Amino acid sequence: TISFITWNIDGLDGCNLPERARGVCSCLALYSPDVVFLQEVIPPYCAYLKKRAASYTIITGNEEGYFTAILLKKGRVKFKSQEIIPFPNTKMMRNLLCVNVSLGGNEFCLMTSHLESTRGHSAERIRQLKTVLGKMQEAPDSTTVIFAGDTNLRDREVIKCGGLPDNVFDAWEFLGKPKHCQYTWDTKANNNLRIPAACKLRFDRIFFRAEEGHLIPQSLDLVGLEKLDCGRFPSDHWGLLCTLNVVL
Ligand SMILES: N#Cc1ccc2cc3c(=O)[nH]c(=O)nc-3n(-c3ccc(O)cc3)c2c1
Ligand SMILES: [Mn+2]
DSSP, rough: OOOEEEOOOTTOOOTTHHHHHHHHHHHHHOOSSSSSEEEOOOHHHHHHHHHHTTTEEOOSOOOOOSEEEEETTOOOOOOOOEEEETTTSSSSOOOEEEEEEETTTTEEEEOOOOOOOOGGGHHHHHHHHHHHHHHHHSSSSEEEEEEEEOOOOOOOOHTTOSSOOOTEEHHHHHHHHOOOGGGGEETTOSSSSSSSSEEEEEEEEEEEEESSSHHHHHHHEEOSOOOTTTTSSSSSSSSSEEEEEOOO
């Protein structure tokens, strides 16, 4: 089994940041995931995580401006190695962060990214998605590969990339597209952006590679839906909490 959260925690919002980081660390302590994949981290936010989620090792690649990180629960997850796959044509300092780990006697390749944002950068986001999916297929065959991140995907962008390969699956699709976690960026239900228009999108996604009768998703749920004391949520995104298990 592996449990993890992926969450774009909007470190670029300076308003209520310490309280919101507290909110995120409260969720980490309550759900106690093995791994946390984070996007839109900024330097002060890391400092907060070191004090208030100290039993997670913070793995980063480049830290310029805002960045991703993979948090590994100490004593559960053993760090083996890291690989950074660049997106040569990014205009937003985006890249693919890979961490090989051991957990429960099994080897994992854990991946995250914040793919190119906005509708205007669709074509580059699609190119980056293709890079991510190719990298997932190249991992050694005895490794469980999990991507979890802020893909910024919408509409038919997955199809335009050539589709998910035959051996890669979207965890939400695999569970039958449940409604309760169908949107991860929802401006009707989330008030952190003070914006008039309704938008419900599923930016945050989890892909996993098939390994024929081993780990599969057992649950998927939103996190971050409790308002904090300031009347806002931890992030403008909802996080995703996912567990995979082996069903023989
Ligand atoms: N402000 C605002 C605002 C309001 C409404 C929408 C609605 C959509 C939609 O229906 N489809 C879509 O693909 N993207 C939408 N964005 C969006 C979201 C992030 C983004 O970086 C760029 C556009 C919106 C943004
Ligand atoms: Mn943001």
